[PDB]
Design an enzyme around this catalytic site. Structure first.
Site, PDB file in Angstrom:
ATOM      1  CB  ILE A  42      -0.845   0.082   1.242  1.00 62.47           C
ATOM      2  CG1 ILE A  42      -1.538  -1.239   1.539  1.00 62.47           C
ATOM      3  CG2 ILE A  42      -1.851   1.166   1.092  1.00 62.47           C
ATOM      4  CD1 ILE A  42      -2.198  -1.244   2.889  1.00 62.47           C
ATOM      5  N   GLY A  43       0.593   2.196  -0.831  1.00 59.05           N
ATOM      6  CA  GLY A  43       1.385   3.420  -0.918  1.00 59.05           C
ATOM      7  C   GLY A  43       2.706   3.261  -1.637  1.00 59.05           C
TER       8      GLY A  43
ATOM      9  CE  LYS B 131       0.244  -1.727  -5.107  1.00 56.87           C
ATOM     10  NZ  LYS B 131      -1.019  -1.084  -4.738  1.00 56.87           N
TER      11      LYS B 131
ATOM     12  CD  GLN C 150      -8.429  -9.673   2.340  1.00 54.89           C
ATOM     13  OE1 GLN C 150      -7.878  -8.612   2.599  1.00 54.89           O
ATOM     14  NE2 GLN C 150      -8.317 -10.247   1.162  1.00 54.89           N
TER      15      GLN C 150
ATOM     16  CD  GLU D 174      -3.772  -0.624  -8.447  1.00 59.19           C
ATOM     17  OE1 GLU D 174      -4.668  -0.089  -9.123  1.00 59.19           O
ATOM     18  OE2 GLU D 174      -3.449  -0.221  -7.316  1.00 59.19           O
TER      19      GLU D 174
END
Ligand code: 5FU
Ligand code: 5FU
EC number: 2.7.1.145
Lengths: 197, 192
Positions: free
Chosen positions: A18-19, A22, A70, A93
């Site tokens: 995360i971060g 992307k 999830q 992605e």
């Protein structure tokens, strides 16, 4: 026999914490929409499941919503991994693998998923791999350090992920490293590491 | 295109409420193992998922475990609905449909599944129907009344399904009726 077998072109998976930038990296491919099938992370679906924002709920109350969240991630990933297409290249992605090997795995470790919930997810992953075709030819790993990643999140509008502790991003980082550097995980196919700093 | 398409023989689904004597009814087919693919409800799997008993947990604490439990049920149903076979006839106790139309639906109504959880399940069901082949040629409905069913559950070996209230079996009964009588072929049998 497997669902969507031989119906898929060359596929590139964009992996990264995360971060790790992307979304930014993928904007560069925007203008090729015509020849490239370009599937971003289905955050939009996760934010609105007939009105329920699973992503927010998962972050606000992990012990209660990780499991359904999830489970939904996995499904949306499959929908992406199998969507049909004309184009000769496909770029996704994240993937079903990052969901399994990093996020679910980490949610087990930090107590968010209880053993019974984790096992249910794993049984699905096991079934999915035996019966649904997941095309993956190249992974581009946007490798970064937890601290740089933490910074990038901090510089962006408050999102739902915004409150995740540096500790969480470290846990996730080590899990990506295990999978894509230390090859500690079934995955077979080539990995192209890029330094995103 | 669909997974396990055209790899399945004529299939009969045994439907019915909890305690409608489905296990009993299926024992009568035991001796035909050689020519009949005979798949009982995968209770065993649900009782033991690497040591976790999901069935017990679901009954003990519905608001916490229905979602994962039902998610698991769906998967075991798919494993049965798609297992490959030589035999010319296949008989399944319960099905992905009873799971969707009766149990999940009921768990939504009585608050056990919250809207977020329910929708997740439904999205899977939607995906499954468009992408996996579910052979279903005939359904045998073991129709009974809630009360007869309740009495039955009481005689038998106490399970997790013991504690269930008559109210629950009524809800389930009406759901089966809605699905099987009030709109493939259904063969209703009076199991009283
Ligand atoms: O498996 C996943 N679990 C997640 O929690 N996420 C989250 O969605 C957000 C963006 O993706 C990020 O906070 C993370 C993504 C996944 F792919
Ligand atoms: O979809 C289902 N939900 C359930 O709760 N069950 C339970 O398992 C038992 C039937 O076997 C009974 O408790 C019920 C079965 C199903 F098929």
């Amino acid at each position: 026999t497997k669902y969507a077998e031989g119906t898929q072109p060359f596929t590139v998976l964009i992996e990264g914490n995360i971060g790790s930038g992307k979304t930014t990296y993928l904007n560069h491919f925007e203008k090729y929409k015509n020849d490239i099938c370009l599937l971003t992370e289905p955050v939009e679906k996760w934010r609105n499941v007939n009105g329920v924002n699973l992503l927010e709920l998962m972050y606000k109350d992990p012990k209660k919503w990780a499991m359904p969240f999830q489970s939904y991630v996995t499904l949306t990933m499959l929908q992406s991994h199998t969507a049909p297409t004309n184009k000769k290249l496909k770029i996704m992605e994240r993937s079903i693998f990052s969901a399994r090997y990093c996020f679910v795995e980490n949610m087990r470790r930090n107590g968010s998923l209880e053993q019974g919930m984790y096992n249910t997810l794993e049984e699905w992953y096991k079934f999915i791999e035996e019966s649904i075709h997941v095309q993956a030819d190249l992974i581009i790993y946007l490798r970064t350090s937890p601290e740089v990643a933490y910074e990038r999140i901090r510089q962006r509008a408050r999102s739902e992920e915004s409150c995740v502790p540096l500790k969480y991003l470290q846990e996730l980082h080590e899990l990506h490293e295990d999978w894509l550097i230390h090859q500690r995980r079934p995955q077979s196919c080539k990995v192209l590491v890029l330094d995103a700093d």
